[PDB]
Amino acid sequence: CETSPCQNQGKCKDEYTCTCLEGFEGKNCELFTRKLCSLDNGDCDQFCHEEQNSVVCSCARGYTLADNGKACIPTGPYPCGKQTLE
Amino acid sequence: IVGGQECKDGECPWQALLINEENEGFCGGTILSEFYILTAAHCLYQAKRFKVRVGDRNTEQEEGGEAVHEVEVVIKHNRFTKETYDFDIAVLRLKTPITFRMNVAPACLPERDWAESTLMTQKTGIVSGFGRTHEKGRQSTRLKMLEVPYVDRNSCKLSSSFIITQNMFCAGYDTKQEDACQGDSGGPHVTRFKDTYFVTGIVSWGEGCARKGKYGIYTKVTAFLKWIDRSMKTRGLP
Ligand SMILES: Cc1cc2cc(/N=C(/NC(=O)c3cccnc3)N[C@H]3CCCCN(CC(=O)N4CCCC4)C3=O)ccc2o1
Ligand SMILES: [Ca+2]
Ligand code: NA
């Protein structure tokens, strides 16, 4: 940890370990978790849009937006756009 | 569909088939909900009377779970232009609701801006139907699907003997022998995103089927998402 291998003020242990501040990930906290729609769809399951420079996710017909604000929860066995399993 | 593969059990559950007074399929449609089917406006002029079949994978064999629905209301886009097929879009409201089951489920309608940035930028979408399996051949009695690459708008316009309006897009192959074909008109073009299928086109027209230097032309669903929403928010007779 002598060189401060952990970026963005993450905390270095010890062959070493990074415990990142919120908002950062990667092994060395070098990757932003906040992102816009252009990258990994904003981490949204379905629809992504930007409000106030911030990502907001939403869901299509037959889904509800999960409390985590990203996942889409089906409202029944036949939600839209899924091939039928049974 | 020329080339591609037969849809497997559950694989293309949003497919609908418009059947004429003789009970012959003549156009496809896409299931949007329990009551609404999306199709091409030009199809409406190609049978005097028609009904909508869902859940069919093999047309020469009743097989339970197939169902035929009457049409209560036809909603053609008023700006459908017969000479150019501009605005080639219609919605059908059914007399009685579809009950979703194996092989019968709706495709998702996407939000417009998202669809433009995240579906229309993908490499490919999937087209399906019961149309001819060869330009000079006959309608499939089996539902087929085909992966078709999106073709950029400039290339599309340059390929075409006919105007490509902003309400249309090209998908398919320059010379590979794979395409949609007569009888597929009105059916689904969908684009996958993270395991979910969203409506991105309606099979519209083509110069022959899978001809070298020609692409399939699809109604561009993004241009009509608002129109589809209005047509659907309607919800039954007053
Ligand atoms: C994605 C996709 C590919 C594809 C190919 C299709 N195929 C045909 N035609 C034949 O293949 C054929 C072949 C030989 C003789 N007659 C007909 N469509 C023909 C059917 C006959 C009418 C001509 N016309 C309309 C037409 O041109 N307009 C020019 C601008 C406005 C409309 C077709 O659209 C049909 C649907 C398809 O959707
Ligand atoms: Ca059948
Ligand atoms: Na071609």
Contact A72, A41 (CB under 8 A): no
A38 and A74 share one domain: yes
- Output the CA torsion sign for A47, A51, A53, A57: negative
What are the beta bridge partners of residue B17? Answer: B28, B53
What are the helix and strand counts (H, E) for chain A? 0, 8
Atom of ligand 1 nearest to the CA of B148: 1
Distance of alpha carbon A9 from alpha carbon A19, whole angstroms: 9
Distance of alpha carbon A83 from alpha carbon B15, whole angstroms: 11
Its CATH architecture, for the domain B13-106+223-238, is Beta Barrel (2.40)
The residue type at A60? A
Domain ranges in chain B with CATH number 2.40.10.10: 1-12+107-222, 13-106+223-238
Residues in chain A closer than 8 A to B54 (CB atoms): none
Q: Is A60 within 8 Å of B10 when comparing Cβ atoms? A: no
Contact B177, B8 (CB under 8 A): no
Distance of alpha carbon B27 from alpha carbon B142, whole angstroms: 14
Residues in chain A closer than 8 A to B194 (CB atoms): 41, 45-46
Strand pairing of A17-19 and A11-13?
antiparallel
A28 and A17 share one domain: yes
Token pair, residue B155, equals 């290339």
Helix (H) or strand (E) holding B156: helix B153-159
A38 and A79 share one domain: yes
Contact B2, B135 (CB under 8 A): yes
Give the chain B residue whose CA is nearest to the CA of A63.
B108
Helix (H) or strand (E) holding B228: helix B225-232
Q: Is A29 helix (H, G, I), strand (E, B) or coil?
A: coil
A27 and A38 share one domain: no
Helix (H) or strand (E) holding A17: strand A17-19
Q: How many separate domains does chain A show? A: 2
Cα B205 to ligand 1 centre (Å)? 5
Residue B30 DSSP one-character state: E
CA–CA–CA angle B25, B109, B165 (5° rounding): 75
Q: What are phi and psi of B192, to 5 degrees?
A: -80, 135
Q: Which fold has domain B1-12+107-222?
A: Thrombin, subunit H (2.40.10)
A21 and A41 share one domain: no
Q: Looking at residue A13, which CATH number applies to its domain?
A: 2.10.25.10
Provide the residue range defining the domain that includes A49: 34-83
Pocket of ligand 1 from Cβ distances under 6 Å:
B 84-85, 135, 162, 179-182, 184-185, 203-206, 208-209, 216-218
- Output the CA torsion sign for A78, A82, B2, B4: negative
Contact A10, A20 (CB under 8 A): yes
Residue B166 DSSP one-character state: T
Burial annotation B67-91 (CB, 10 A radius, 16+ → b, else e): eebebeeebbbeebeeeebbbbbbb
Distance of alpha carbon B100 from alpha carbon B236, whole angstroms: 19
Cα B29 to ligand 3 centre (Å)? 23
A28 and A39 share one domain: no
Tell me which residue has tokens 């017909």: A61
Distance of alpha carbon A29 from alpha carbon A12, whole angstroms: 10
How many contacts does A have with B, using Cβ atoms within 8 A?
73
A62 and A26 share one domain: no
Contact B50, B95 (CB under 8 A): no
Token pair, residue B212, equals 């070298």
A41 and A58 share one domain: yes
Q: Is B69 helix (H, G, I), strand (E, B) or coil?
A: strand
A18 and A47 share one domain: no
CA A1, distance to chain mean position in Å, is 28
* Nearest-CA distance A33 → chain B (Å): 19
Give the resolution to one decimal, in Å. 1.9
Distance of alpha carbon B51 from alpha carbon B215, whole angstroms: 30
A19 and A46 share one domain: no
Q: Does B228 touch chain A (CB under 8 A)?
A: no
Q: Annotated catalytic sites of B, by residue? A: 42, 88, 185
**How big is chain A by its Cα radius of gyration, in Å?**
18
A5 and A38 share one domain: no
Residues in chain A closer than 8 A to B100 (CB atoms): 76-78, 84
Distance of alpha carbon B37 from alpha carbon B198, whole angstroms: 14
Distance of alpha carbon B3 from alpha carbon B216, whole angstroms: 13
Cα B61 to ligand 2 centre (Å)? 4
Distance of alpha carbon A55 from alpha carbon B111, whole angstroms: 15
User: Pick from A48, A76, A83: which is nearest to B10 by CB?
Assistant: A83
Kindly give, in sequence order, each residue whose CB lies less than 8 Å from that of residue B154, ignoring residues fewer than 6 positions away: none
Burial annotation B143-165 (CB, 10 A radius, 16+ → b, else e): bbbbebbbbeeeebeebbeeebb
What are the beta bridge partners of residue B31? Answer: B37
User: Pick from B102, B117, B198: which is nearest to A86 by CB?
Assistant: B102
A41 and A79 share one domain: yes
Distance of alpha carbon B192 from alpha carbon B184, whole angstroms: 20
